[PDB]
Amino acid sequence: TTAPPVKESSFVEKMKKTGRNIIVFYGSQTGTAEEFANRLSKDAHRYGMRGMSADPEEYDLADLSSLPEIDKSLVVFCMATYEGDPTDNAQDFYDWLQETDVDLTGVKFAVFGLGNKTYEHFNAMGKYVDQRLEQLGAQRIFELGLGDDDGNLEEDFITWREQFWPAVCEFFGVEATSSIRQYELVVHEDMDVAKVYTGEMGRLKSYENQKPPFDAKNPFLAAVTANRKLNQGTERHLMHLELDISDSKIRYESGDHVAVYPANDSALVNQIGEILGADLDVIMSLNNLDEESNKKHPFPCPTTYRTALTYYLDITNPPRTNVLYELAQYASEPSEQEHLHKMASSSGEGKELYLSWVVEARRHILAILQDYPSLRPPIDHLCELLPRLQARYYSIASSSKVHPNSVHICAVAVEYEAKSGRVNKGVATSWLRAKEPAGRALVPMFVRKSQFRLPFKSTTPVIMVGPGTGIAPFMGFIQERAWLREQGKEVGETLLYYGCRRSDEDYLYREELARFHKDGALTQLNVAFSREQAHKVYVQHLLKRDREHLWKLIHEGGAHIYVCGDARNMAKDVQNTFYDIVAEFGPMEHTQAVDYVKKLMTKGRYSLDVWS
Ligand SMILES: Cc1cc2nc3c(=O)[nH]c(=O)nc-3n(C[C@H](O)[C@H](O)[C@H](O)COP(=O)(O)OP(=O)(O)OC[C@H]3O[C@@H](n4cnc5c(N)ncnc54)[C@H](O)[C@@H]3O)c2cc1C
Ligand SMILES: Cc1cc2nc3c(=O)[nH]c(=O)nc-3n(C[C@H](O)[C@H](O)[C@H](O)COP(=O)(O)O)c2cc1C
Numbered sequence: 001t002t003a004p005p006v007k008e009s010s011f012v013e014k015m016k017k018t019g020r021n022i023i024v025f026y027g028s029q030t031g032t033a034e035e036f037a038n039r040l041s042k043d044a045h046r047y048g049m050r051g052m053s054a055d056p057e058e059y060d061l062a063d064l065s066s067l068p069e070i071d072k073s074l075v076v077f078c079m080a081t082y083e084g085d086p087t088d089n090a091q092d093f094y095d096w097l098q099e100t101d102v103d104l105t106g107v108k109f110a111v112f113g114l115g116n117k118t119y120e121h122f123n124a125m126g127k128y129v130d131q132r133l134e135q136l137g138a139q140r141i142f143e144l145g146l147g148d149d150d151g152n153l154e155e156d157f158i159t160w161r162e163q164f165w166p167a168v169c170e171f172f173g174v175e176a177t178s179s180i181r182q183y184e185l186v187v188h189e190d191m192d193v194a195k196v197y198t199g200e201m202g203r204l205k206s207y208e209n210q211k212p213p214f215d216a217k218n219p220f221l222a223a224v225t226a227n228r229k230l231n232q233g234t235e236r237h238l239m240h241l242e243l244d245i246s247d248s249k250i251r252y253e254s255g256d257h258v259a260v261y262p263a264n265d266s267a268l269v270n271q272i273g274e275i276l277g278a279d280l281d282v283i284m285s286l287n288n289l290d291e292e293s294n295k296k297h298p299f300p301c302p303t304t305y306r307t308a309l310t311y312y313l314d315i316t317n318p319p320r321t322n323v324l325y326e327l328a329q330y331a332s333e334p335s336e337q338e339h340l341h342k343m344a345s346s347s348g349e350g351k352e353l354y355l356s357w358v359v360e361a362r363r364h365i366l367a368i369l370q371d372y373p374s375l376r377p378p379i380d381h382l383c384e385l386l387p388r389l390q391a392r393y394y395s396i397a398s399s400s401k402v403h404p405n406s407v408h409i410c411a412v413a414v415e416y417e418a419k420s421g422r423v424n425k426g427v428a429t430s431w432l433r434a435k436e437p438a439g440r441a442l443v444p445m446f447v448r449k450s451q452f453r454l455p456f457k458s459t460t461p462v463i464m465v466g467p468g469t470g471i472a473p474f475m476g477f478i479q480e481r482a483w484l485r486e487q488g489k490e491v492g493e494t495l496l497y498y499g500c501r502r503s504d505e506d507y508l509y510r511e512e513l514a515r516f517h518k519d520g521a522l523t524q525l526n527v528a529f530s531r532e533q534a535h536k537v538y539v540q541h542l543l544k545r546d547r548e549h550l551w552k553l554i555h556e557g558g559a560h561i562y563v564c565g566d567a568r569n570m571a572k573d574v575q576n577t578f579y580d581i582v583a584e585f586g587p588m589e590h591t592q593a594v595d596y597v598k599k600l601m602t603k604g605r606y607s608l609d610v611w612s
């Protein structure tokens, strides 16, 4: 559930007033689709047209029926998919699409879906919108784009976009017409301190003066009460943090996710300013040159560049091609300007260089500024080009039944040697690792309700599979199932299938799990130590070992299956093992076993909390 915002007045009438003929809506949750929509809206101008981006949530898409009132009009949808559903901001549009009977005759559209092939329902939202608009009477002007974040989404967009525009120009009889700034810089001298943002996300001083309810736009600064290392070795750093949410009025259940707004590495920020020869402490504002847009700034303003680079901008992920394309003008060495220019190529050496030199090598903006030393853009323009710093999600590792005023986190710190030649540090995990309990160590956060939940009936059996940090939500599940037993409730079997390299090196929550097992909260504690023998022993091997009993729990006990952790290979391997279990004991042919397992998913008996 989520209260709906007050809609803006019809977007078509706004297009008429502003001379726009193309509008690109974005269904986005991590800002990717938003960037893609903005890029397409900007492209229009280079083809003799004029566009605008827009959040579908702020509008009534029913006005699409009025779009034909504008000559040679066109609407484009850049939609990402999440858990097989629309992004939060596109749920309204989705619901309307299903219930409406409105006739969209005359409407011209195009859709670029953002997805990831490793998920069950790949690009489910983009596919639905593309098909539904046509059923409603609209006509497709260009083929559905299927972006796959498992390969390279940026390239899928480049390829689609390169074909899209010629198609649009050809159909509407328009033609291809210099760098253009979206914002203008306004430096502020003598400005009061009370009016300068310092990292807050919503209203000025919202971090200092905390007022509920707390959410993505108004995060609660939670005190880190505990932050300890969970593993023994020095190979990696796995940690457990406990955030105090007392007096926040925030509610949560095991299975939910906790999001945090981190701060970038200050040395990284410092170095960017230094290499550009810029004063990061200048207070300024970037104001939209289009006084009509509601998006007055790229991020909270006024503020210093240092604050923007630290809290509002992404300065670690590989820059996307349009950014490097716009920065090329600032490279005084011809050969460097040429490389940056060609990064936007849909094929050839330009594309190959971008994929290996920028993406594979994981070069962040500073690395590029260092490796292409002639590249010296003005700081204000770079800040306008960089993407927004996103919050990071973690599977809450505690049960609100046991810890109603504390939200636990289990994570592995990200730190690796990149082919770019430097050690790359994970933004959120490096920041979290540094938070020391007791001044207060505060973490801006909020909770996102998920559908990953323990069975309603205490008696229903639970099968938990979560190797490595995948154990996170299960520490919450187990705490809760233990609590239910302590409260006199009858609890069905609770089985954990966990995995790590070695018992004495990275066996997370070893002591806590042993106790739950001893007390009976855990009916079985099955642990696969992948490196204690020559052969790899994984959780799926244990599931295969216990195939007969698991089938009993699944077929006779109505047991619920839960998988958390690596979605790339572990999740699939585990799924395939369940297919094999069902096939042997049904019995039934593979094809039928697959349908059976996918059916458990729809019936809410096989849930996933997987990530990359
Ligand atoms: C719903 C959901 C639940 C999650 N739950 C948890 C959880 O409970 N515990 C947990 O630990 N994580 C979990 N995560 C992952 C978490 O959100 C972050 O992505 C993770 O903590 C890293 O964030 P960061 O800011 O530290 O690193 P970032 O700065 O975001 O960097 C991450 C990127 O670094 C790159 N990278 C990482 N290692 C390498 C490498 N070795 N070589 C090349 N590239 C690499 C990859 O592109 C990776 O995407 C979850 C993610 C989702 C979506
Ligand atoms: C928790 C999570 C769940 C996802 N579920 C799906 C999914 O079901 N189907 C799909 O095609 N892509 C899925 N994706 C991939 C996103 O759709 C893809 O990364 C998209 O580029 C994100 O766009 P955004 O930044 O505009 O929200 C998922 C990503 C995350 C992080």
Ligand SMILES: Nc1ncnc2c1ncn2[C@@H]1O[C@H](CO)[C@@H](O)[C@H]1OP(=O)(O)O
Pocket: 467, 468, 469, 499, 500, 501, 528, 529, 530, 531, 536, 538, 539, 540, 569, 570, 571, 573
């Ligand atoms: N494909 C897979 N299926 C199940 N577990 C896997 C897996 N790949 C790696 N693991 C194991 O997941 C645990 C947490 O990372 C480790 O024991 C790791 O073992 P490995 O690293 O020795 O391969």
